[PDB]
Motif scaffolding. Structure first.
Motif, PDB file in Angstrom:
ATOM      1  N   UNK A   1       0.804  -1.217   0.000  1.00 25.76           N
ATOM      2  CA  UNK A   1       0.000   0.000   0.000  1.00 25.76           C
ATOM      3  C   UNK A   1       0.838   1.269   0.000  1.00 25.76           C
ATOM      4  N   UNK A   2       2.076   1.208   0.498  1.00 26.21           N
ATOM      5  CA  UNK A   2       2.889   2.416   0.615  1.00 26.21           C
ATOM      6  C   UNK A   2       3.287   2.935  -0.761  1.00 26.21           C
ATOM      7  N   UNK A   3       3.535   2.035  -1.708  1.00 28.99           N
ATOM      8  CA  UNK A   3       3.845   2.452  -3.066  1.00 28.99           C
ATOM      9  C   UNK A   3       2.618   2.925  -3.831  1.00 28.99           C
ATOM     10  N   UNK A   4       1.428   2.535  -3.404  1.00 23.85           N
ATOM     11  CA  UNK A   4       0.210   2.887  -4.133  1.00 23.85           C
ATOM     12  C   UNK A   4      -0.150   4.336  -3.817  1.00 23.85           C
ATOM     13  N   UNK A   5      -0.421   5.164  -4.820  1.00 24.40           N
ATOM     14  CA  UNK A   5      -0.755   6.567  -4.569  1.00 24.40           C
ATOM     15  C   UNK A   5      -2.249   6.803  -4.393  1.00 24.40           C
ATOM     16  N   UNK A   6      -2.557   7.966  -3.823  1.00 21.33           N
ATOM     17  CA  UNK A   6      -3.940   8.366  -3.606  1.00 21.33           C
ATOM     18  C   UNK A   6      -4.584   8.702  -4.941  1.00 21.33           C
ATOM     19  N   UNK A   7      -5.727   8.089  -5.211  1.00 21.00           N
ATOM     20  CA  UNK A   7      -6.449   8.283  -6.446  1.00 21.00           C
ATOM     21  C   UNK A   7      -6.485   7.078  -7.356  1.00 21.00           C
ATOM     22  N   UNK A   8      -6.240   5.883  -6.832  1.00 22.27           N
ATOM     23  CA  UNK A   8      -6.164   4.661  -7.609  1.00 22.27           C
ATOM     24  C   UNK A   8      -7.279   3.719  -7.186  1.00 22.27           C
ATOM     25  N   UNK A   9      -7.530   2.714  -8.012  1.00 24.05           N
ATOM     26  CA  UNK A   9      -8.650   1.808  -7.822  1.00 24.05           C
ATOM     27  C   UNK A   9      -8.115   0.486  -7.293  1.00 24.05           C
ATOM     28  N   UNK A  10      -8.489   0.151  -6.059  1.00 19.87           N
ATOM     29  CA  UNK A  10      -7.810  -0.861  -5.257  1.00 19.87           C
ATOM     30  C   UNK A  10      -8.795  -1.974  -4.919  1.00 19.87           C
ATOM     31  N   UNK A  11      -8.325  -3.224  -4.939  1.00 17.17           N
ATOM     32  CA  UNK A  11      -9.121  -4.354  -4.473  1.00 17.17           C
ATOM     33  C   UNK A  11      -8.179  -5.426  -3.940  1.00 17.17           C
ATOM     34  N   UNK A  12      -8.769  -6.536  -3.467  1.00 21.71           N
ATOM     35  CA  UNK A  12      -8.083  -7.583  -2.687  1.00 21.71           C
ATOM     36  C   UNK A  12      -7.365  -7.011  -1.468  1.00 21.71           C
ATOM     37  N   UNK A  13      -7.995  -6.044  -0.808  1.00 20.89           N
ATOM     38  CA  UNK A  13      -7.369  -5.396   0.334  1.00 20.89           C
ATOM     39  C   UNK A  13      -7.359  -6.343   1.521  1.00 20.89           C
ATOM     40  N   UNK A  14      -6.180  -6.548   2.090  1.00 22.93           N
ATOM     41  CA  UNK A  14      -5.996  -7.386   3.259  1.00 22.93           C
ATOM     42  C   UNK A  14      -5.720  -6.522   4.480  1.00 22.93           C
ATOM     43  N   UNK A  15      -5.850  -7.126   5.650  1.00 18.14           N
ATOM     44  CA  UNK A  15      -5.796  -6.382   6.900  1.00 18.14           C
ATOM     45  C   UNK A  15      -4.646  -6.768   7.806  1.00 18.14           C
ATOM     46  N   UNK A  16      -4.412  -8.049   8.010  1.00 23.35           N
ATOM     47  CA  UNK A  16      -3.255  -8.454   8.768  1.00 23.35           C
ATOM     48  C   UNK A  16      -2.162  -8.874   7.805  1.00 23.35           C
ATOM     49  N   UNK A  17      -0.954  -8.308   7.939  1.00 23.66           N
ATOM     50  CA  UNK A  17       0.006  -8.284   6.826  1.00 23.66           C
ATOM     51  C   UNK A  17       0.558  -9.637   6.420  1.00 23.66           C
TER      52      UNK A  17
ATOM     53  N   UNK B   1       0.317  -4.027   4.249  1.00 26.66           N
ATOM     54  CA  UNK B   1      -0.607  -4.935   3.595  1.00 26.66           C
ATOM     55  C   UNK B   1      -0.432  -4.866   2.087  1.00 26.66           C
ATOM     56  N   UNK B   2      -0.702  -5.985   1.424  1.00 24.46           N
ATOM     57  CA  UNK B   2      -0.548  -6.094  -0.021  1.00 24.46           C
ATOM     58  C   UNK B   2      -1.924  -6.170  -0.661  1.00 24.46           C
ATOM     59  N   UNK B   3      -2.297  -5.111  -1.367  1.00 24.73           N
ATOM     60  CA  UNK B   3      -3.576  -5.036  -2.048  1.00 24.73           C
ATOM     61  C   UNK B   3      -3.325  -4.831  -3.529  1.00 24.73           C
ATOM     62  N   UNK B   4      -4.023  -5.597  -4.352  1.00 23.17           N
ATOM     63  CA  UNK B   4      -3.865  -5.514  -5.790  1.00 23.17           C
ATOM     64  C   UNK B   4      -4.507  -4.238  -6.332  1.00 23.17           C
ATOM     65  N   UNK B   5      -4.323  -4.008  -7.628  1.00 23.98           N
ATOM     66  CA  UNK B   5      -4.744  -2.768  -8.267  1.00 23.98           C
ATOM     67  C   UNK B   5      -5.682  -3.088  -9.419  1.00 23.98           C
ATOM     68  N   UNK B   6      -6.886  -2.534  -9.363  1.00 22.82           N
ATOM     69  CA  UNK B   6      -7.823  -2.604 -10.463  1.00 22.82           C
ATOM     70  C   UNK B   6      -9.245  -2.641  -9.942  1.00 22.82           C
ATOM     71  N   UNK B   7     -10.175  -2.831 -10.872  1.00 19.85           N
ATOM     72  CA  UNK B   7     -11.559  -3.173 -10.556  1.00 19.85           C
ATOM     73  C   UNK B   7     -11.629  -4.646 -10.161  1.00 19.85           C
ATOM     74  N   UNK B   8     -12.833  -5.149  -9.947  1.00 21.61           N
ATOM     75  CA  UNK B   8     -13.055  -6.584  -9.988  1.00 21.61           C
ATOM     76  C   UNK B   8     -14.006  -6.833 -11.146  1.00 21.61           C
TER      77      UNK B   8
END
Lengths: 90, 44, 272
Positions: free
Chosen positions: C131-147, C187-194
């Motif tokens: 998530x740290x590399x991902x910038x504000x304004x992007x479309x995010x999914x597969x968001x996880x909570x415990x790393x 946490x590692x969350x992928x990038x895109x729609x579903x």
RNA sequence: AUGAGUAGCGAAAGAGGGGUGAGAAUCCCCUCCACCGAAUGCCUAAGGUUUCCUGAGGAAGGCUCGUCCGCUCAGGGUUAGUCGGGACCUAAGCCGAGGCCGAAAGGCGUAGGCGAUGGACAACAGGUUGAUAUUCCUGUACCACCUCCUCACCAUUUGAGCAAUGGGGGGACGCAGGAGGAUAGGGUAAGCGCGGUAUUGGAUAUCCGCGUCCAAGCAGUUAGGCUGGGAAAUAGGCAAAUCCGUUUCCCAAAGGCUGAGCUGUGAUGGCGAGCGCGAAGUUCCUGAUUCCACACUGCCAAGAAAAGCCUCUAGCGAGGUGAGAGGUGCCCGUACCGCAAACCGACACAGGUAGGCGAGGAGAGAAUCCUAAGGUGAUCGAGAGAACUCUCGUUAAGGAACUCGGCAAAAUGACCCCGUAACUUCGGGAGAAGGGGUGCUCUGUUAGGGUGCAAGCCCGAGAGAGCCGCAGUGAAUAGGCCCAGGCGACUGUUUAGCAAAAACACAGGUCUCUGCGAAGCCGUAAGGCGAAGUAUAGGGGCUGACGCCUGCCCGGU
RNA sequence: CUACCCAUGUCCAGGGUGAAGUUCAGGUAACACUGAAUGGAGGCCCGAACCCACGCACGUUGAAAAGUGCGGGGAUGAGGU
């Protein structure tokens, strides 16, 4: 297992006297004597070369006389066939 | 009429068997009353 | 897209299904499958403790790594398949090492495209980043909570989420139904729609089609007799007797909020 | 005891002649006429436990006698390497070392192992007694396992070979629908074999009767269906990698895995109409619900597992691999009944009972109607043909007046052809309605098709001719239709055993709870349902498809 | 027994009805469209096995502590065991 203790009695039927003319002899064995025992019994007793052994086992007939409700013990008979040119037994 | 006793010996002796009545503490009392009474057919 | 049906009988009257434009191939390979004992609510106490479920069409599970724990190894999209157990299509990519894994195909993937799951990947629709590399304004999914557990929150079809802020140790995340959540930044969350975007507007039609999906029907409240439900009785279609319509157990179900008030996740939530 | 020798005698065709015997409408024989025959017939689970078998016995047990038997007596009857189940695997579910440190108990947690209706697997075809038979026997085979051995080949440290509880492949999976390929069976169609030509008029062959065959195994062969192959490189398959897995080039038919059958053997047999003996034993046509086979295509609801298998190395390694001989191969289940008089129903009770086979004529038919093989006359009878009771059969004149009401009953039905309204959510409504022609013989071994090489067989379109009866799907048997009306949209489900709907369910609508250790639930903890899910998801309430719509009141709760 | 449920095999005679597609022809600048053939989907239709009890009749110290008789509603899916 001791060989003379394996068998109990022969069988005297019409099936017996037919098959005694057919080089094979029925025997009434106890409940737990296995097939390779019965084959190895006859050569350990009589020395007669055995073709093969087949084993039946009857179940308890409902015999009752008077009042009581007994059942006859089961009988495990065994048909033993001998090889060709082997010694017959009475 | 599918009458109420449809016997099937595997379904019988696994509910009411000797070992199946030997699978708790309460299974033993069922045989314990059945022994101190004097019954002949102990299990089913 | 979505295919309609002309009414050959009164069954297929309003029935709309999907056309399966996305799903190319029909054979999930043997290395990734899994058996599914259907349950319907019961386990070793044998009691119906979830209502309305039992016996649809039987299923064989397709194991998906939502973790994306492979790092720095370039992937390659090969097949997009059906998946029964969830709402979303899944994609079987092939990595360079041959470790075949499933993912969730986002809206815009095609056969033969590249996906890097590495932590310093280029941002593109389908990749996996922390998530740290991902910038504000992007479309995010597969968001996880415990790393490093694996994907948790925005996972079903048609959906997405969005980052709002990068504080540091926490990450502002906007979810669906507008909820803002503080999230641990490792946490590692992928990038895109579903990638369905039409699973909602599927007019089922029959009652048999939405039994096939593992639903058994639902008897209402004011129909059961007054011990089996606290609405019922009455001499015919009687109204809601008790004030504020209660559940079949002793809780009301209109506006009666049911989170633990002393929940340990108070610090992480801003809005609801 | 009473009712009183009064009700009942549990669906069904026998009658006659001999025989047995004290005694027989019933028991045993023969004769015909009877009845079922997608079952009242053969196999076989579930279960039943001696009923099966022969030989005697009639005190009771049969809704009746009874010489008889599912009864009572003394004997006798089941044989396996192969399939049915074990020493093969595994899901559901359960049992569960520790551990989860439980008012005593105790749900039982992975490991591990139970548990088949699943997958896996070696064998059939003919006789045979009064009872067993893919077990006995006679033929003819395979299956793993072992060399007392004989031949081979390879190699004893790159040293041939083995191949693991490890790796991978493969086993490995659904529903509809339709060609194609082949086959059980069916026709007696031709031809052949054997037998007979009748006395009721006729018919010497122009006729009639019956029979017109054979595996497993092995050897070849095959309708086809699959699947691209080669070669190098490897962040992978916890180590290992030649196998997979990807990645690059090189070729685009070959190859493999597959197989129903086919033919040769098997057969210098065995069956076989017929009188212990035994003939011919072909060809054509029909043609599956079984086989290729979930093989193909299509749809969407996204359709078990593990082990035999095959491969990879790890590792094992001084005699092995191949062939031939010789040899071993265990326990149970096996009788008999299994739409039943041997089981569940208190009974020899008009009920119920999964599965495999399933014949001909017309027929689309597994419908119906007689019939084959085969099984049955079923356990109270004879004698008058009564009020009454019921299931049935006809009624001239009349048609709903009957009645709570067309309840009941008749009326309609088959296939071909013509014709079809309102409304409609365009799918329908509709088989709407309304009528019409259907038989037999001749133009016809037909027009035409299938099939075959022809020969011949099946399929029979339309007409013309003409004969027949009242009739022409002549028998059985398969929609009664039309006008509106509310209530429920709809197919579905419950008041086992008064009440099938106007109730429930239902798709869709919809307000709300619930950020994932969700909420809700089981219920004092656990644990792993919700969910190998994650707001296009999951509980809960309220209504009920769709179309038009859902206004006012936040004072009290 | 039954009420749902869990894994697992298994059965359903035939006939009708004909959509989504497909292809060809026509048509359009090109998709719309049109006509044929093909293809065969359906909690589709009629009707056996098989389930199921609606309507009368029979029964009711019944053949039977819920049946049989003459007919009836589903019968490829929310199905039957």
């Amino acid at each position: 297992k001791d060989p003379r203790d394996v068998l109990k009695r022969p069988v005297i039927t019409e099936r017996s006297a037919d098959l005694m003319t057919e080089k094979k002899y029925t025997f009434e064995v106890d409940v737990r004597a296995n097939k390779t025992e019965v084959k190895d019994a006859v050569e350990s007793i009589f020395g007669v070369k055995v073709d093969k052994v087949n084993i039946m086992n009857y179940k308890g007939k409902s015999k009752r006389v008077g009042r009581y409700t007994g059942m006859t013990s089961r009988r495990r008979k065994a048909i033993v066939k001998l090889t060709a040119d082997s010694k017959e037994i009475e | 009429m599918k009458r109420t006793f449809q016997p099937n010996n595997r379904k019988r002796s696994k509910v009411h068997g000797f070992r199946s009545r030997m699978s708790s503490k309460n299974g033993r009392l069922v045989l314990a009353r059945r022994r101190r009474k004097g019954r002949k057919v102990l299990s089913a | 897209a979505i295919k309609k049906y002309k009414p050959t009988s009164n069954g297929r009257r309003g029935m709309t299904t999907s056309d399966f434009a996305e799903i190319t191939t029909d054979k999930p390979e043997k290395s990734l499958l899994a058996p599914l004992h259907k349950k319907g609510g019961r386990n070793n106490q044998g009691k119906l403790t979830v209502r309305h479920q039992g016996g649809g069409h039987k299923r064989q599970y397709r194991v998906i790594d939502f973790k994306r724990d492979k790092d720095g190894i370039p992937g390659r999209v090969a097949t997009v398949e059906y998946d029964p157990n969830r709402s979303a299509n899944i994609a079987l990519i092939n990595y360079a090492d041959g470790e075949k894994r499933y993912i969730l195909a986002p809206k815009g993937i095609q056969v033969g495209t590249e996906i890097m799951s590495g932590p310093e990947a280029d941002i593109k629709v389908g990749n996996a980043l922390p998530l740290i590399n991902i910038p504000v304004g992007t479309v995010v999914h597969n968001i996880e909570l415990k790393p490093g557990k694996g994907g948790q929150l925005v996972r079903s079809a048609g959906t997405s989420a969005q980052v709002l802020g990068k504080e540091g140790k926490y990450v502002l995340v906007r979810l669906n139904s507008g909820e803002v959540r503080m999230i641990l930044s490792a946490c590692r969350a992928s990038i895109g729609q579903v990638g369905n975007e039409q699973h909602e507007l599927i007019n089922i039609g029959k009652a048999g089609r939405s039994r096939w999906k593992g639903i058994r029907p639902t008897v209402r409240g004011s129909v059961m007799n007054p011990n089996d439900h606290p609405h019922g009785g009455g001499e015919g279609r009687a109204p809601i007797g008790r004030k504020s319509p209660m559940s079949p157990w002793g809780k009301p179900t209109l506006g009666f909020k049911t989170r633990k008030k002393k929940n340990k996740s108070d610090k992480f939530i801003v809005r609801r």
